[PDB]
Amino acid sequence: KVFGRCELAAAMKRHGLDNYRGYSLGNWVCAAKFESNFNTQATNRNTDGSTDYGILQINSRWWCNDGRTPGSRNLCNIPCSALLSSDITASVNCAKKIVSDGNGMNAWVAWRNRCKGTDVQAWIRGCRL
Amino acid sequence: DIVLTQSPATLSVTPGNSVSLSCRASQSIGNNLHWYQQKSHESPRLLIKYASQSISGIPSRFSGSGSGTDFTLSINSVETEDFGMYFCQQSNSWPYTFGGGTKLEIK
Amino acid sequence: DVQLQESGPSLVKPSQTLSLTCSVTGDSITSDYWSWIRKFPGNRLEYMGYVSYSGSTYYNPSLKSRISITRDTSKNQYYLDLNSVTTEDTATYYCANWAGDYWGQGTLVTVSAA
């Protein structure tokens, strides 16, 4: 499924991401935009053997299990397959656990290069929420 | 620092009735609110996550709703094994906090 | 299946350091975030803190910096240290995973002269 910007911001807000552990709502929209282009089915296989899954590109080495990944830790206790769905539930539930580590949103590399230190609330302006 | 207020503090009911418990947040926490049960001399038990997401192994008679600042836990036909303490907890902001508790007393 | 178990003394003196241990069985401690919760005598619950997978820690400010949470990956345990306890630290201490899915049985610690 490919979200529109305002569609994803209204969904991420119903999913409790507005101001979750100090991160305002535009951070989450800007992150989805550069990590997956708003696509719930995006997948990317990495240099290291891991694969990144879904709309928030959750990694198979630390967070979900894809059975092909070496030191797999499965912190979200979830098969990677469950994050490639149109329903954003599972991807939000795991992302809330990811951000609750001391590294915060720095675990999303596109967010670190394209959103941090930018006016992230622009990602939610012009929308009915 | 989020303060969660639970009402009523005590709820007496007869087996087979339906009850509703409230948990109110002093600030908006979106859907980031979990409910636990605690029976006498037992550890807490997680019943509901993120305001309404159900959990395997829990009776279906429990469900939760609400968002923002106002949340509810309902129990359809309360059974005897349901009597004890009920607490809500927010995980939206550090420190995580708990509500004062509602006791479900057999009436 | 995961099981959690608290251990440590049940009676401590004012001003010493309370130390408790949480042994985890059924899965490695490197697969979750782990926390300490305590229940005061009138039903009051207090989330103390948690350690996350990177080793970073989150401590409740009500503790005023007397707490430390560490873990031992080869023993599969994690630990609570609480410095300079007073009679106000009298409570039932629980270990639990970060989301509240698994909890130990709880251990009542009493702080008192002797």
Structure-token pair, residue B6: 């639970």
- Cβ contact (<8 Å) for A16 and B31? yes
**Using CA atoms, how far apart are residues B41 and A87, in angstroms rounded to an integer?**
39
Task: Give me the domain span that covers residue A95.
Answer: 1-129
Give, in order, the Cα–Cα distances in Å from C30 to each of A27, A72, C72, C103. Answer: 28, 11, 10, 17
Q: Give CA–CA dist A11/B31, Å, rounded.
A: 12
A66 is known as an active-site residue:
no
Tell me if A20 sits within 8 A of A99, measured CB to CB: yes
CB atoms within 10 A of CB C26: 10
Smallest Cβ distance to B92: which of A15, A20, A93? Answer: A20
Structure tokens at C68: 């430390």
Give the Å distances, CA to CA, from B24 to A15, C92, C100.
18, 26, 20
CB atoms within 10 A of CB C77: 18
**B4-7 β-sheet, strand order:** B4-7, B19-25, B70-75, B62-67
Distances from the Cα of A72 to the Cα of A67, A75, A102, C21, C32, angstroms: 8, 9, 20, 27, 13
3-state DSSP assignment of residue A44: strand
| Domain carrying residue B84 | 1-107
- Number of domain units in chain C: 1
Q: Are A99 and A21 in contact (CB under 8 A)?
A: yes
Q: Evaluate whether C53 touches C73 at the Cβ level (below 8 Å).
A: no
CATH of the domain at B107: 2.60.40.10
Report the CATH number that the domain containing residue C60 is assigned in CATH.
2.60.40.10
Question: What is the distance between the alpha carbons of residues B36 and C111, in angstroms, rounded to a whole number?
Answer: 28
List the CATH number of the domain containing A118: 1.10.530.10
- In chain A, which ranges are continuous DSSP H helix? 5-14, 25-36, 89-99, 109-114
SS3 of residue A17 by DSSP: coil
Compute how many other C-beta atoms are within 10 angstroms of the C-beta atom of residue C72: 12
Q: Is the Cβ–Cβ distance between B12 and B103 less than 8 Å?
A: no
Whether residues C100 and B100 touch (CB distance < 8 A) is answered with no
- Method used to obtain the model: X-ray
Query: How many domains does the structure of chain B reveal?
Result: 1
What is the secondary structure of chain C as a DSSP string?
A: --EEEEES-SEE-TTS-EEEEEEEESS-GGGS-EEEEEEETTTEEEEEEEE-TTS-EEE-GGGTT-EEEEEETTTTEEEEEE-S--GGG-EEEEEEETTSS-B---EEEEE---
Question: A64: number of CA atoms within 13 Å, CB side?
Answer: 24
CA-based nearest residue to B47, from B71, B68, B69, B70: B71
Annotated binding-site residue numbers of A: 101
Contact assignment for C100 to B87 by CB distance below 8 Å: no
Q: Which of A59, A72, A75 is the best substitution to test chain C (most C C-beta atoms within 10 A)?
A: A75
**Residue in the structure block whose two tokens are 């490639």:** A84
Q: What angle do CA A97, B92, C82 make, to 5 degrees?
A: 80
Instruction: Give the total number of structural domains in chain A.
Output: 1
CA-angle at C106, arms to C105 and C108, nearest 5°: 140
Distance CA B34, CA B55 (A): 11
Nearest to C43 among B36, B89, B101 (CB): B101
Side by side, the strands of the sheet bearing C67-72 are C3-7, C18-25, C77-82, C67-72
Structural domain harbouring C90: 1-114
Q: Which two tokens stand for residue A61?
A: 């080495």
